[PDB]
Structures are given as structure tokens and as C-alpha cells.
Amino acid sequence: TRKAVIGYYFIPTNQINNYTETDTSVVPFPVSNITPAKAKQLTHINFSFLDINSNLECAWDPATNDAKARDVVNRLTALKAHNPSLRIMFSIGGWYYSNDLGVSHANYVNAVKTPASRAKFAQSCVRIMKDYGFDGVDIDWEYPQAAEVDGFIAALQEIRTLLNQQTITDGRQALPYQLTIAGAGGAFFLSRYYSKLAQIVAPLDYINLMTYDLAGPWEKVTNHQAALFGDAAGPTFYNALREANLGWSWEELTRAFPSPFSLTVDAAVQQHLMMEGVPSAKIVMGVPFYGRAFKGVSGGNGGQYSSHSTPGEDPYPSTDYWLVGCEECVRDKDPRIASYRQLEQMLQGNYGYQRLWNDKTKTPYLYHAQNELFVTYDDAESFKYKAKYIKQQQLGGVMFWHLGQDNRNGDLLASLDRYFNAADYDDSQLDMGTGLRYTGVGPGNLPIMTAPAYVPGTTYAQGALVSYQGYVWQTKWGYITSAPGSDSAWLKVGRV
Amino acid sequence: TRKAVIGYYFIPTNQINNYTETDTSVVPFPVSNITPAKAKQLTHINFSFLDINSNLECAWDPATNDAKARDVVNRLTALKAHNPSLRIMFSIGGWYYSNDLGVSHANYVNAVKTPASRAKFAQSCVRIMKDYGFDGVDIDWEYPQAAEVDGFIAALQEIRTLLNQQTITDGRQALPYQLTIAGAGGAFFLSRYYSKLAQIVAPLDYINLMTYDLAGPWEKVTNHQAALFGDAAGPTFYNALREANLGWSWEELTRAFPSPFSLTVDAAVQQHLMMEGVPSAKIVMGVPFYGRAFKGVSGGNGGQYSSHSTPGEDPYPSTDYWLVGCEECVRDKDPRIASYRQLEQMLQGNYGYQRLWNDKTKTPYLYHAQNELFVTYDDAESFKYKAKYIKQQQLGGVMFWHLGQDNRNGDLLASLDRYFNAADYDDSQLDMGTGLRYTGVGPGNLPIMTAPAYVPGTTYAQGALVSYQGYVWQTKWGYITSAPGSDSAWLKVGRV
Ligand SMILES: Cc1cccn2c(=O)c3cc(C(=O)N[C@@H](C)c4cccnc4)c(N)nc3nc12
Ligand SMILES: Cc1cccn2c(=O)c3cc(C(=O)N[C@@H](C)c4cccnc4)c(N)nc3nc12
Ligand SMILES: Cc1cccn2c(=O)c3cc(C(=O)N[C@@H](C)c4cccnc4)c(N)nc3nc12
């Protein structure tokens, strides 16, 4: 089956209200820049962002010019003329609206609180979808906390019920309405809802992992923001999932969640696959179309794993635009982020940047030796390894943030489509390297094993293996007279 | 409050049927050996063992001559003339009847299953108590498994109701009928029911911990069977409580259950006190009146912590009766167990045994240099430290197995009574030594702590301490925007 290729189309309210396809100074990436060829390379466009208002309903930003918003959306859905599989989703939430300290955060908490609120909120999602002509709903709440999770699940199940009814009512069996969420791609936020992943993902077509921003100026040491695999020379992190509300035993937590660990894309994917009832085909790997820049870095290792002097604040609390050559950093008053398009132009502009490659993480980076700068980003080469990982691990596909950051030729999108679909591309010998893999093991990714059937009445010694109720179990100590599952002495170590 | 001194009186069915007070070779320890002096030193005698039959009622062994049984019991209750506080309990169960592979185990499991079965079992316990003249009920099920614990708890509650009503009916307010159980003294069996200790202990007057047999021939290395504190030179063990079904986080399990650990009397007591709702006054420390012998120890340090050639099968499968001096080893055809009485006559009779002392564990042991022998046991000196521990930790008292193993003068029982009650004994300067203490922290031993109140909307760094909803919490990583208890990021570390 075709891998999903999910591109975010983000447009701020002031750009909707002043929308034009002819002046890149007010609208840098108008819908016009999505050519028929690029539309064929996408399977989904996530239009973003809508919000939940204090009426606990899905809504546009109050300052939106609704006439212009409908026209922007109509230009997007017109791209379906070039790609019959294309879906224009809309995204509710995002960091600014929905984070704990965000302007609308309470509206997310309250909308999922009660059966009445969830019914009302779900209806409004389907009404927005049908009124504007969208093809599905994406929820980007970053992120529900443990006690909010059951309400989150029931709202998603409510949306699933209404979308499946709307699919039948509209005769959309060939292209059913879809429901997705953006998921944490790092253990710290993932531990909020990790224990209920199975019930979260059940009503979804896809969970889109935000497997980027895994490094930033809020960390004391520079690092790669979307390392595929780990580098032993880089920083490691507390494994927050061992503290999730799982109810597992000490051995089960320990073998699933080594700590410290390397905060990588592979870690995020494997951590989802470790949960029973989380199918690989629904997991979608996010990739960034932007780089993160650091200043004040030391030398020796190309700016990698160095202390730095980058402000972590938001907004950027200065007027010092120190990322040399980055015109778009001036236009946006922040030198700590650059689009792939801009980085490509910084490279071919003789600004003293050097493009280096980390063969462990399988990601590129820029080093500026004169001014002490470090940029972590992804490109078409790092996407080869990520695409191969998606195929080997049988994931659902790829998601990226965001379309306006690709270069004008659409090279990053074309590469993702090529690695999944081009008949003359062949990655069977692509060397995935010796970077650190995530070695945790959980109930959902237990190895296949064989063992003699458990025999009631037997006394087992320490380390004995038996099969019982479809799993292979090992005794943790000696003189075991109880059945696996009936007593703390048995560890589930294998399936079938 | 006077400390309990609970002595098991164990008499097998063949000795009941053949009971006589004038022939040691048929009844080695008739009740007439319990003089008025000794009766005054006890608070309880646990007559043992009764059973649960296939009708799921408390019952004598079917081969018991019932008139002979009443006579033996009458000899015990006659002792109450010399001590108005003394109670003659009867014990239901024991290892042979109630272990998973024992002959009556299914009757324990099935008696506690439903309200009807529990009411029938409980009624039978009180009927037996009144019919034979006992003063209370002791249940020694070794040990209920996790799925049986709730029924076990409800059966104990039902017995408690019937006992309390019987106390009223009989005008026994001055000496009310009591309910006790034997509890596991090591973490392996403790883990079966650990999570429900509070509801198990609620209906009891006492839980008598079997804090002995903590070492034996079944282990690869010689060790003390009832060490008070740990010896760093000694073996350590897997802390099975970390695998109990508690629902705690990795950090919480790790701090409550260090592993490996020293398997000691102190460990068992502190493990019980770690659980909320378990009052120290109900905890009774078991001590052995017997030793365990190892055949084939190397030299080095008294035979402590070395390899051995002792079989670990029961029944004793062989015939090398190799514990020399020990004549009861021939009569009972097993050289690995010797009563204190016999161990004393071995030390008296020029057999080459040397008595040594471990000042970490505060226990004695015998070493034989020629035959390579090691014996771990308890004596009046080790009981000084255990009695002081009972007083310092405010435990309910002491229990021992069993009365027939004391010497003819009853020195062990007299020593326990002395250390609790003699005005001319003064342990105020007894130094408890530097042996390893169990230092796990759980809900029941959380310290008082003080921290500024949690303030919603603020972002906390790693290691921040705040007070919230009755507890002091610490963050496990940085950028914490959630409230404590509602999250994986917060660790309960203290009480307000
Ligand atoms: C300060 C801080 C602490 C911890 C986590 N943080 C974030 O996860 C975060 C995310 C974004 C954001 O917008 N990410 C983009 C890629 C995106 C795309 C699609 C859906 N959601 C988000 C942001 N601007 N600031 C952020 N700051 C923090
Ligand atoms: C508390 C206690 C009291 C009396 C006897 N006990 C045991 O006999 C015993 C045995 C084992 C064990 O596992 N194996 C033994 C059989 C073994 C294994 C391999 C070779 N030889 C012998 C054990 N774990 N605890 C045990 N506890 C006790
Ligand atoms: C083979 C084996 C494995 C694991 C644990 N085991 C035991 O814990 C055990 C205990 C006894 C026993 O009698 N203990 C006395 C002190 C007692 C006193 C009062 C109430 N209950 C018991 C026993 N004879 N064999 C036992 N074998 C084992």
C-alpha cells in the first residue's frame, strides 16, 4: 500500500486576511506554489491551524477574514484535480493554541470533559470539515495530561463515529474521511498519555509523530534535532516513560525503558511499537523542513555537543540577527530557525558555512568556524535513511513541517516521493550505519519464542521457560509453584 | 503495653493419639514440661496444627483420636490458672497442609471464595474454638496468592466479627478472643500479598512474621538463617517486592526496594512498615529455637558464606547422619536441623564445635574445623538485640517456633521474658552495631518535608520541590508545566 506523505500548509491569520499569489513579501508561500507535480507527490495536506474557542467548538481564529479563508481553502482543494488520492485535512491546535501555557489551553481541557461537551465538540469538527470542504480532521493538542486522556479518547471515538457516518452519507467509500493526531516524538511529553496509546490510536487513521525539535536552544548542549539513530558522543536523556502510568513491574519497566537514552527518531518509533495494540501501519514519521541554529559554539567537533549562548526564550528577546546570510531570519526576527530553502542559499553564498555529515545519526549539519555557529537540519540525503527506516519498520508513511520551507523546486518533497515510489530508485544496499538503536522491549514487540507448555503442579527453577496463554514466560527466581500471570515470579519474555 | 511472647506448641497426630507424660521416646515434649514459671513467661501458646477439610470447614486431622486431643488441649488451658493473661490459640494450616503443593491447599483456596463459603468457614473456626476451649484463632496459610487475597481478607473480617460477638456473649471483655496470622518473613513469598498488607492486618490483633529459615542448604552459600542486620560480606538476594502488583513508578519501586539486598529480620520488618496502614504494634517478630547445619564448608571465616555439600531435598533422601553429637538427628533421621536444646548439649560434650559471633548480624554460629561444619542458630545473646529492636521499633512482641526445642530449663523463653519485663535487666547501653539496615522508602515511611506551595502557571526546573495536596513533590526533569500528581514528571518525596 502507498506510503502516506503528509505536508503541513501553515498560513498565519494576517496572511489569510491579506492573501495574494503575487507578492512573496506578504505571503511567502501561496497555494500557487503547489504545482500539479507537487500535488501528486503528496497524499495529505494538513491546513493549519484552527482552534477550540470558549464555546468549546472548533473554530477559526476570531480575527480571520472568513471570505478570504474560504478562498485559500478552495485553492487547496482544487489541487485534488491533479491527484485523486489527495486529502486536504485541517489541523486543530498546534503549540501556540494548545500547550499548557497557551492562549486556548483551557478550551481543550473543557471540550473533552463531559459526554455533552465531547458530543458538541465532535459535531463542530464535522461541521467545519463539511462547510469548508476539508477531507478530514487532525487534532494537534500538545498535549493532554494523564487525567485528561480518557476524555481525549472518547472525543476521538466520537469524531470517528461521525466521520464514518459522513463517509457513508456522502458516498466517499473510495476516499473516506480521516482522523489523525500529531503525537509527541519525544519521551517527556509522550509520557503524559503513553499508557493509553492503544485506545488513542484505535479511532485514528494515523498518529503523526513530531519526531523533530529533539534539540533546541533550551538545552545546554547543541545536538541534532531529528537524529535517526544515536551517537554515543552526544547528550543522553532521562527516559521519562519509565515513570508513565503503566502499572508494570520493575523488570518490565527496566527492559522497556533504558535510562539514560538517545533522544532519536528511532527511539520514538520503537517506543510506540513497544505498546500492545499500536499497529506499525498507523505510525507516521515526522521530518522537519527547517534547521535550528545555535551561536557561541566551540570547535573541534564541528559545533556538535558544545555549550552555546543561544537564547532559549520565545519570542526571540533581541534584535541581533546573527545567522549570517539568512535574509528570512531578519524578515521573521529570529535567527534560531531557518527553512531548508534559506539554508540551501546560505550554503551556495560563500558565507563561510561548511556542510558536515554525522554518519551515526545519519543527518547533516552546518558549521561556521569564524562566528561559532551550528545548524542542525535534514536534507534529501538524511531522508534516504528515514525513508528506508519507514519501509523496513512498515510504518504508515511520512509527515513534514512544513511545505513553505522547501526550496522552490520542491526538492525535499520530491525526494520523499522518490524513495517511496520511484521504480528506478533502489535502496536495498543503503547502509543504515552503526548508530545507537533503541533496545527497549515491551509487550507489543516481544520476540517470537518456543517453550514447553506450563504444567500445573510443577516446581520450576530460576530461569525456566514455559509457554502459557500464548506467551513464553521466564521465572525470575527459584522454586516457582504458581502459574504465569497468577504471581509476581514470572516474566513475559516472548510471544506465541 | 506488655509485649506478646507467642510460643508454638506443635504436636503431630501420632503423638496426640499416643500422648503420655512419662516416655520421651514417644512424646519428646509433653505439656507437663511447661511449668508454672514458663506459663507466666508466655502470653500466647499456638497449639498447632489444625486444618481445613474438603467440606471447607476448620477441622482436626481425621486420624485424630478426639478424646486424646481434648486431653492434650486441656493440659494447655489448665496453664491459665498460673497466668490470667495467657491465651491458648490454635493454628490452622502450617507448611505441610497449606503450601501450594500441600495436601489441603485447595481447601484454603475454596473456603475463602464466596460469601457463603467464608461464612461457613468462619463459623467452623469459632465452633472449634469454643468446643475445645481455645482463646483465639491463628491462620497459617503459606501463602495466599494474589487472586486469593481479597477472599482471604474477607474471611478474616468474617472471623473477626464472630469472635467479637463471642467475646460479648461469654463475658470475655477482660480477655477478648483474638485473631492472628503467620506472615511470610522473606520478600519472595511476601510479594504474593504485599500490596494488600493493610487490609490483611486490619482484622488482626497480630501478624507473626516468620523471620527465620532466611538461609538453608537449598542456597548455594552458607548464611545466617535469622540475621538481625545485614553483613556486607554475606550473600545478597533479589528483592522480589519490586515485582509485586503495586502500580508504582520506576523511581518509586527503586527507592522502596533496593536490589540486591540483605535478607534479614530487619528487612522484613521495615518492608512491612513501608506500607501505609500497617501499625508497628501489630507486627510480631518470629525467632527460631532451632539451628540449621551445613555439611562440607570450606575454611576461612567460621564457615560463613562458603560452599557446601548439604542436600536440600525433603524428606531427607539419604543416610549419612553427619551432625556429630546430635543424637536427635538420628531419632528424626535428618542432620540439617537441630534444636537449641541439642545444640547446647553438643557444645557441652567435647565434639570439636566452636561457638562464634557475627557482630554485624548480631547472631551466633557454630564452626567445626575438622568435619567442615557450620550451624546457624539463635541464643539468649542474639535475643538481646532482637528484643531491643522490638522495643525501639515499637513492635507487638516476639513469636517463636517452637516450645519443644528450648532446653529443659527453658532458658530461651526465660531470656525473652527477661528482656521485655525484668526490672533488673537494663539494655539501655546495648550497642546495636553497624550491620546493614534496610533503607527503602515507601508510602508508610515518607518523611515530613517542607516546600513552597505549587503555583499553577509556573514552569519548574529539574529537582524543584513544591507542596501540593498533602505531599511534597520533586520534578524528575526540567520545563515542568503540569501540576503534581497529574503527571509523570512529579515524584512524591514527603508528607506535609
Ligand atoms: C519552549 C518549549 C518547551 C517544550 C516543548 N516545546 C515545543 O514542543 C514547541 C513547539 C513549537 C512548534 O510550533 N513546533 C512546530 C514544529 C509544530 C508543528 C506542527 C504542530 N505543532 C508544532 C514551538 N514553536 N515551540 C515549542 N516550544 C517548546
Ligand atoms: C524457607 C524454607 C524453609 C524450609 C525449606 N526450604 C526450601 O527447601 C527451599 C528451597 C528452595 C529452592 O528453590 N530449591 C531447593 C529445593 C533446591 C534447588 C536446587 C538444588 N537443591 C535444592 C527455595 N528457593 N527456598 C526454600 N525455602 C525453604
Ligand atoms: C521446600 C520449601 C520451599 C520454599 C519455602 N519452604 C518453607 O517455607 C517451608 C517451611 C516449613 C516449616 O515447617 N516451617 C516452620 C518453621 C513453620 C512454623 C510455623 C508455621 N509454619 C511453618 C517446612 N517444613 N518446609 C518448607 N519448605 C519450603
List, as one string, the DSSP characters of A191-257: TTTGGGHHHHHTT-SEEEEE---SS-TTSSB---TT-SSB-TTS--B--GGGGSS----HHHHHHH-
Residues with CB under 6 A from ligand 3: A 479; B 8, 94-95, 140, 142, 182, 213, 401
Report how far residue B295's alpha carbon sits from residue B311's, in angstroms, rounded to the nearest whole number. 9
- The 3-state DSSP class for residue B152 equals helix
Residue B95 touches chain A, beta carbons under 8 Å = no
Please check whether residue A411 is in contact with residue A57, taking contact to mean a CB–CB distance below 8 angstroms.
no
Within an 8 Å CB–CB cutoff, is residue B20 touching chain A?
A: no
- Distance CA(B180)–CA(B203), nearest Å, equals 9
- Please count the CA atoms within 13 angstroms of the CA of B158 that sit on its side-chain side: 21
- Let me know: does A343 contact A377? Beta carbons within 8 Å: yes
| Subunit contact A486:B238, Cβ cutoff 8 A | no
Nearest to A138 by CA among A74, A2, A47: A47
Q: How far apart are CA A404 and CA A414, in angstroms?
A: 14
In one-letter notation, the amino acid at residue A118 is R
Cα separation, A411 vs A197, in Å, equals 34
The verdict on the CB of residue A182 being under 6 Å from ligand 1 is yes
Short-list B376, B55, B428, B414, CA closest to B228: B376
Q: Do B238 and A477 touch (CB under 8 A)?
A: yes
Q: Does residue B218's CB lie within 6 angstroms of at least one atom of ligand 2?
A: yes
* CA dist list (Å): A341 to A290, A379, A406, A418: 8, 10, 5, 19
Residue A478 CB less than 6 A away from ligand 2: yes
Radius of gyration of chain A (CA): 24
A9 CB neighbour count, 10 Å cutoff = 22
Determine the Cα–Cα distance for residues B352 and B450; give it in Å rounded to an integer. 60
Provide the CA A37 distance to its chain's centre, in angstroms. 25
Instruction: Break chain B down into helix, strand, coil percent, rounded to 5.
Output: 35, 20, 45
Active site residues of A: 142
Any atom of ligand 1 within 6 Å of the Cβ of A140: yes
B443: Cβ–Cβ under 8 A, 6 or more apart, which residues?
B274, B275, B276
| Distance (Å, whole) CA B313 – CA B424 | 46
Q: Which residues of B466-483 are buried (b: 16+ CB within 10 A; e: fewer)?
A: bbbeebbbbbbbbebbbb
Dmax over CA atoms of chain B, in Å, equals: 83
Give how far B28 is from chain A: nearest CA, Å: 33
Element holding B6 (H helix, E strand): strand B4-10
Spell out which residues of chain A touch residue B477, defining contact as CB-CB under 8 Å: 188, 238, 240
8 Å CB contact of B477 and A238: yes
d(CA B147, CA B155): 14
3-class SS of residue B403: helix
Q: Which three cell numbers stand for residue B310?
A: 548439604
Residue ranges of domains in chain B:
1-288+379-446, 289-378, 447-496
Per DSSP bridges, beta strands A87-93 and A44-52 are parallel
d(CA A326, CA A335): 8
Cβ contact B240–A477 (<8 Å): yes
Sequence-ordered list of residues with C-beta below 8 angstroms from that of A389, at least 6 positions apart, any chain: A228, A265, A266, A269, A285, A395, A432
Residue B340 contacts residue B290 (beta carbons within 8 Å)? yes
Which residue lies with its CA nearest to atom 15 of ligand 2? B218
In B, which residues are within 8 Å of A473 by CB distance? Answer: none
CA distance to A449, A491, B216, B244, per residue, from A463 (Å): 15, 10, 21, 18
Helix (H, G, I), strand (E, B) or coil at A351: coil
User: Quick one: which H or E segment has residue B290?
Assistant: strand B290-295
Work out the minimum CA distance from A458 to partner chain B, whole angstroms. Answer: 9
Q: How far is CA A386 from the centre of its chain?
A: 13
Biggest CA-to-CA distance, chain A: 81
Residue A274's Cβ-count burial label (10 Å; 0-12, 13-18, 19+) is buried
Pocket of ligand 2 contains residue B213 by CB under 6 Å? yes
Please, which experimental method was used? X-ray
Residues in chain B closer than 8 A to A218 (CB atoms): 479
Q: For residues A21 and A34, give the distance between their C-alpha atoms in angstroms, rounded to a whole number.
A: 11
Q: In the β-sheet with B373-376, what is the strand arrangement from edge to edge?
A: B337-339, B290-295, B373-376, B363-368, B353-358
Cα–Cα distance, B300 to A15 (Å, whole number): 85
Beta-strand runs (E) in B53-185 = 58-59, 87-93, 136-140, 178-184
Please say whether the beta carbons of A178 and A369 come within 8 A: no
Alpha helix (H) ranges present in A56-139? 66-77, 95-98, 105-111, 115-132
B142 noted as active-site residue: yes
Atom of ligand 1 at shortest distance to CA of A402? 18
Residues 6+ apart with CB under 8 A from B171: none
Nearest CA in chain B to A148: B486
Calpha distance B137→B160 (Å, rounded): 9
Alpha-carbon distance B420 to nearest alpha carbon in chain A (angstroms): 38
Q: Do B244 and A488 touch (CB under 8 A)?
A: yes
| Residue among B146, B218, B253 whose CB faces A487 most closely | B146
Q: Are B403 and B392 in contact (CB under 8 A)?
A: no
Tell me the CA distances in angstroms from B246 to B90, B375, B442, B471, B485, one per residue in order: 33, 37, 11, 19, 17
Residue type, B433: G
- Distance CA(A134)–CA(A126), nearest Å, equals 9
Chain-centroid distance of CA A167 in Å reads 26
Q: Which atom of ligand 2 is nearest to the CA of B312?
A: 22
Instruction: Nearest by CB to B487, from A146, A251, A487: name it.
Output: A146
Measured in residues, chain B has a length of 496
Cell numbers 515499637 correspond to what residue?
A: B394
Identify whether the C-beta of residue B322 lies closer than 8 Å to the C-beta of residue B337.
no
Contact A489 B249 (CB under 8 A): no
Containing B110, the helix (H) or strand (E) segment is helix B105-111
Parallel/antiparallel/unpaired status of strands B471-475 and B490-495:
antiparallel
Would you call A240 an interface residue with chain B, using a CB distance cutoff of 8 Å? yes
Residues of A in contact with B459 (CB under 8 A): 101
